[PDB]
Amino acid sequence: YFQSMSLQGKVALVTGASRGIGQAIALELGRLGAVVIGTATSASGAEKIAETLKANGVEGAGLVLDVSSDESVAATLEHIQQHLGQPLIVVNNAGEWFDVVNTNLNSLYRLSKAVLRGMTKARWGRIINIGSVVGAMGNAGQTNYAAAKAGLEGFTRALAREVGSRAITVNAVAPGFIDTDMTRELPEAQREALLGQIPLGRLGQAEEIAKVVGFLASDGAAYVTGATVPVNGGMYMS
Amino acid sequence: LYFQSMSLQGKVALVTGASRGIGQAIALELGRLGAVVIGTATSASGAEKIAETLKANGVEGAGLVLDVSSDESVAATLEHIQQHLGQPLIVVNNAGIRMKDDEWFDVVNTNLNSLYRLSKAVLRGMTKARWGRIINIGSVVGAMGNAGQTNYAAAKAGLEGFTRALAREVGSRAITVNAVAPGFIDTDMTRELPEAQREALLGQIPLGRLGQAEEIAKVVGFLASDGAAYVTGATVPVNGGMYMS
Amino acid sequence: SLQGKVALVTGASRGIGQAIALELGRLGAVVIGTATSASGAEKIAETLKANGVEGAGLVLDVSSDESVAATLEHIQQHLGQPLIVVNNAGIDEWFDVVNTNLNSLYRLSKAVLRGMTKARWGRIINIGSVVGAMGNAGQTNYAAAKAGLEGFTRALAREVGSRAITVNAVAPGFIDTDMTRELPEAQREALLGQIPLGRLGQAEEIAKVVGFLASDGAAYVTGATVPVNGGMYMS
Amino acid sequence: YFQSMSLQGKVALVTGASRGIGQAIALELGRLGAVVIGTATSASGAEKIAETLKANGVEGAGLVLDVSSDESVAATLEHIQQHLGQPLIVVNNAGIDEWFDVVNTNLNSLYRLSKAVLRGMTKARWGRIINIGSVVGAMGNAGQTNYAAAKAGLEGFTRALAREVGSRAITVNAVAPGFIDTDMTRELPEAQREALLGQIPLGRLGQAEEIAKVVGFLASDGAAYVTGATVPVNGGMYMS
Numbered sequence: 016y017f018q019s020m021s022l023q024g025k026v027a028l029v030t031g032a033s034r035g036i037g038q039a040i041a042l043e044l045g046r047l048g049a050v051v052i053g054t055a056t057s058a059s060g061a062e063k064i065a066e067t068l069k070a071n072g073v074e075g076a077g078l079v080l081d082v083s084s085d086e087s088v089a090a091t092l093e094h095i096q097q098h099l100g101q102p103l104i105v106v107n108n109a110g111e112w113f114d115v116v117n118t119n120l121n122s123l124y125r126l127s128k129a130v131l132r133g134m135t136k137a138r139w140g141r142i143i144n145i146g147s148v149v150g151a152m153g154n155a156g157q158t159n160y161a162a163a164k165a166g167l168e169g170f171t172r173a174l175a176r177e178v179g180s181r182a183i184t185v186n187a188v189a190p191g192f193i194d195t196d197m198t199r200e201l202p203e204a205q206r207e208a209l210l211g212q213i214p215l216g217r218l219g220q221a222e223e224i225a226k227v228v229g230f231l232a233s234d235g236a237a238y239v240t241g242a243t244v245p246v247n248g249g250m251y252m253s
Numbered sequence: 254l255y256f257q258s259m260s261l262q263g264k265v266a267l268v269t270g271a272s273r274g275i276g277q278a279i280a281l282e283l284g285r286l287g288a289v290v291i292g293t294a295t296s297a298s299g300a301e302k303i304a305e306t307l308k309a310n311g312v313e314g315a316g317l318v319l320d321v322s323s324d325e326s327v328a329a330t331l332e333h334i335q336q337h338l339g340q341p342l343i344v345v346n347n348a349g350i351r352m353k354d355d356e357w358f359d360v361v362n363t364n365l366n367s368l369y370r371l372s373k374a375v376l377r378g379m380t381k382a383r384w385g386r387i388i389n390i391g392s393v394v395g396a397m398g399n400a401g402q403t404n405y406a407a408a409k410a411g412l413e414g415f416t417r418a419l420a421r422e423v424g425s426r427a428i429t430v431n432a433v434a435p436g437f438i439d440t441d442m443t444r445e446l447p448e449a450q451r452e453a454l455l456g457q458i459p460l461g462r463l464g465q466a467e468e469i470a471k472v473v474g475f476l477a478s479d480g481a482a483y484v485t486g487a488t489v490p491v492n493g494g495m496y497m498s
Numbered sequence: 499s500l501q502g503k504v505a506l507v508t509g510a511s512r513g514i515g516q517a518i519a520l521e522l523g524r525l526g527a528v529v530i531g532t533a534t535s536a537s538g539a540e541k542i543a544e545t546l547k548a549n550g551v552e553g554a555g556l557v558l559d560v561s562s563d564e565s566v567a568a569t570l571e572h573i574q575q576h577l578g579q580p581l582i583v584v585n586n587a588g589i590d591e592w593f594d595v596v597n598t599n600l601n602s603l604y605r606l607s608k609a610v611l612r613g614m615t616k617a618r619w620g621r622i623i624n625i626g627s628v629v630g631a632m633g634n635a636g637q638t639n640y641a642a643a644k645a646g647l648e649g650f651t652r653a654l655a656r657e658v659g660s661r662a663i664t665v666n667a668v669a670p671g672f673i674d675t676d677m678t679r680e681l682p683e684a685q686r687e688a689l690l691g692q693i694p695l696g697r698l699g700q701a702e703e704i705a706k707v708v709g710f711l712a713s714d715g716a717a718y719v720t721g722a723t724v725p726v727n728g729g730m731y732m733s
Numbered sequence: 734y735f736q737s738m739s740l741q742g743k744v745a746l747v748t749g750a751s752r753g754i755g756q757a758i759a760l761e762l763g764r765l766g767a768v769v770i771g772t773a774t775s776a777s778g779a780e781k782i783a784e785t786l787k788a789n790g791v792e793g794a795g796l797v798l799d800v801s802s803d804e805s806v807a808a809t810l811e812h813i814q815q816h817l818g819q820p821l822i823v824v825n826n827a828g829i830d831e832w833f834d835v836v837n838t839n840l841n842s843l844y845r846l847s848k849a850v851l852r853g854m855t856k857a858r859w860g861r862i863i864n865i866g867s868v869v870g871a872m873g874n875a876g877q878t879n880y881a882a883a884k885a886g887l888e889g890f891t892r893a894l895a896r897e898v899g900s901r902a903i904t905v906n907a908v909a910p911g912f913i914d915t916d917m918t919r920e921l922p923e924a925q926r927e928a929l930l931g932q933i934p935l936g937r938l939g940q941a942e943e944i945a946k947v948v949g950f951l952a953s954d955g956a957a958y959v960t961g962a963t964v965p966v967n968g969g970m971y972m973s
């Protein structure tokens with residue numbers, strides 16, 4: 016059918032939506048017809064999200080959420096339920112190597128567990144996990160990226176297996192080197208070395224992540240689950 | 254003249270093995286998205302069936318006879334398409350060629366040699382246009398036991414590696430190369446199963462059902478689009494959560 | 499040969515852990531095996547003595563910072579620094595189990611690394627869990643634990659490599675243990691039919707791989723997970 | 734006079750044994766007690782192999798083999814059968830936009846050889862096939878492409894063949910080297926060498942002997958439950 020009908024009738028929760036990849040996802044799910052709730056860690060972030068949605072003709076809301084807190088999670092979901100409805104599309108974009116991976120996976124799990132009750136009841140759902148962008152400094156940066164990706168992949172596949180019988184899919188998107196504020200002011204030598212390892216020869220656009228998410232949220236992705244889609248211009252780091 | 258804003262309009266898509274099943278659903282999905290579609294089969298009747306199926310669904314294009322194992326068939330088929338329809342810039346390779354666990358070698362070797370032949374031939378046009386999409390379709394699970402697993406895991410491993418390598422080679426030209434790896438989709442093999450076997454098969458699939466051909470096609474249609482321009486070298490599994498390697 | 503080396507093997511009172519303890523001892527290491535109880539520890543100490551292996555049995559709870567620190571201090575004072583460390587002890591449930599096991603691996607590994615850093619040599623070898631149950635939940639849990647094991651092992655290897663410490667893992671498939679022994683004949687048969695070699699693995703066959711990874715000739719292997727599964731791959 | 738060697742009584746065929754990794758594997762299997770047949774593509778290679786085996790006290794032979802030729806394969810194996818015995822340990826270390834043809838041909842060669850030696854293993858109900866992957870051949874994107882493609886084909890092939898032959902207690906495994914100290918790496922500029930080392934957690938190149946040791950373990954009885962596996966030997970440098 017028509018693109019702006021793809022998600023009509025669905026409420027999407029997108030964490031970390033005030034800028035960058037998260038904002039582009041919020042706008043793309045809106046354009047596909049979802050009601051969109053974007054989150055930020057501050058009140059002004061939340062308000063910016065609400066304004067950006069309105070400016071682009073997307074219905075929904077901006078909210079304050081801290082995915083590391085049980086209380087923030089439970090309160091936020093109760094707010095959404097009462098005022099907008101049950102979020103059946105959930106995009107986790109809000110985030111040395113050990114602590115970071117362990118904490119991010121704990122956060123994914125907390126949020127996922129909380130939104131699954133609604134999806135179990137509806138017998139339908141989409142959980143999409145967004146991995147971290149390539150950039151960070153070092154052999155340490157490489158270590159950290161490969162570890163986070165490996166944890167993201169394994170988690171996503173496990174959770175998909177658990178929830179599959181309820182027609183809930185769980186997938187992940189693993190970005191490579193994407194043009195965000197974080198990557199834009201990386202020293203020129205690191206940026207160049209990164210470009211030289213990307214077959215397409217350019218950075219990815221936030222919108223190019225968002226499009227993949229939008230597809231995974233759609234009905235035609237209903238038999239994709241447990242998958243991690245790399246969006247990296249052909250640069251594979253393991 | 255009619256200019257579409259967010260569609261495959263103006264693109265010519267070649268879909269090999271389009272007379273039934275997955276290939277046919279892909280041909281119809283790319284047509285619905287606005288491409289001109291050339292579907293192929295190894296026989297005149299398959300080609301005719303394709304041409305009729307396109308016309309019934311309002312899709313412009315053609316059914317052609319193509320044998321991907323033959324240099325002559327490949328070159329002739331591409332020359333024909335060039336002259337009459339234009340340069341195919343979306344190419345979907347879906348044509349591949351008691352099941353025992355020794356059949357993996359010949360099948361994987363023949364199919365990769367065919368993927369390579371076709372891909373090489375259509376790359377010239379994509380290089381010249383500085384745009385392209387090559388999308389390789391994997392083989393479905395062909396049988397229920399050990400041999401079935403062995404042959405499916407081998408074909409999927411060859412497909413993944415080949416796709417990633419080719420993507421690296423052509424990336425600088427803004428040509429993406431991806432693959433779609435199906436799991437269990439509705440087939441004769443699954444239809445002719447005893448009820449206990451069918452139920453045990455479904456119990457190995459987290460979603461609890463077989464996949465539809467259309468559900469493969471939708472993933473291919475996305476890969477062909479502009480918004481998948483940064484996806485390359487990837488193999489998207491479409492298997493309801495059933496992962497076998 | 500491992501003469502002159504002190505090896506710590508967690509979970510050594512039976513099965514895979516015990517076979518690893520005896521194998522490293524046969525290769526000449528001084529061996530400290532651990533159990534969660536005083537009787538387990540004592541059984542370990544008796545087994546080592548019966549096989550002529552110098553070392554000790556100790557009580558260790560890898561989930562406790564105090565147990566870890568105390569245990570390592572005990573070993574340092576009485577036997578020396580453990581430079582070969584084999585982690586074989588482990589604790590909708592896939593999440594908590596994996597998350598806790600990786601937290602334990604990390605705790606122990608971080609503690610034993612001081613001594614390896616000081617020696618400029620080390621071997622950490624993580625043992626994966628055997629397939630724990632038949633069918634989908636068993637597959638989910640096993641694949642998840644294996645995936646977390648592989649990624650963790652690779653990341654740690656990258657962090658400690660410059661100190662000539664290797665970090666590797668061994669991922670067993672179906673091994674002849676109490677779990678597989680208490681299976682009904684029909685289940686056992688169906689299981690064998692999914693294993694190309696057509697038999698269950700022996701605990702000793704895990705121990706031999708570990709014994710090799712502990713050796714000098716494995717010095718360029720790091721970050722690797724060796725599957726010991728008779729050709730049965732699940733993920 | 735009597736020593737119990739872990740491969741005593743076994744005949745090992747090692748392809749590509751005249752230098753480097755293949756030679757170190759031939760010497761290692763010999764030290765472990767096997768009778769060793771090393772091959773090369775030329776008569777002088779073969780002779781060099783035979784001299785090296787003799788200098789190290791290893792029984793066996795150097796032979797000319799071209800793994801791309803059915804005639805050379807069948808003739809060479811028949812020769813070995815008649816004069817030395819059935820090779821029950823086989824180590825494939827011989828190889829020849831080019832990624833395709835190289836990988837595709839090497840896997841076709843592995844298959845030809847493997848198929849030919851399997852009848853003897855089937856008869857004995859015991860075997861070891863060990864496939865050696867290519868070292869990283871060049872710095873840069875093409876080098877990465879070719880290396881990742883070869884490794885991916887090697888892994889998939891090795892796992893499939895293992896599945897096919899498992900019921901006969903024949904194991905099939907691969908060893909995937911990273912950067913090993915040989916002529917290619919020995920002659921890089923100091924800045925490139927230092928940057929290469931900085932991508933290897935262990936901070937050094939691997940030795941040929943360190944690949945040979947892993948092979949020697951895989952050939953042993955204690956590796957009997959390892960099959961289908963690809964052991965990376967790369968100092969922690971993982972490229973895919």
Ligand SMILES: CCn1c(NC(=O)Nc2ccccc2OC)nc2ccccc21
Nearest residue numbers: 116117120162166169170642646649650
């Ligand atoms: C947080 C520990 N961890 C994990 N996984 C993890 O924590 N959980 C996990 C991993 C795989 C599958 C399911 C999981 O549940 C968290 N993967 C890692 C990879 C590299 C370093 C650490 C990793």
Ligand SMILES: CCn1c(NC(=O)Nc2ccccc2OC)nc2ccccc21
Nearest residue numbers: 362407411414415836837885886889890
């Ligand atoms: C037919 C031999 N073969 C090949 N042959 C091959 O040419 N593979 C290949 C070529 C280019 C790039 C990647 C490749 O494999 C992943 N790949 C296989 C994978 C699994 C089982 C057998 C395979």
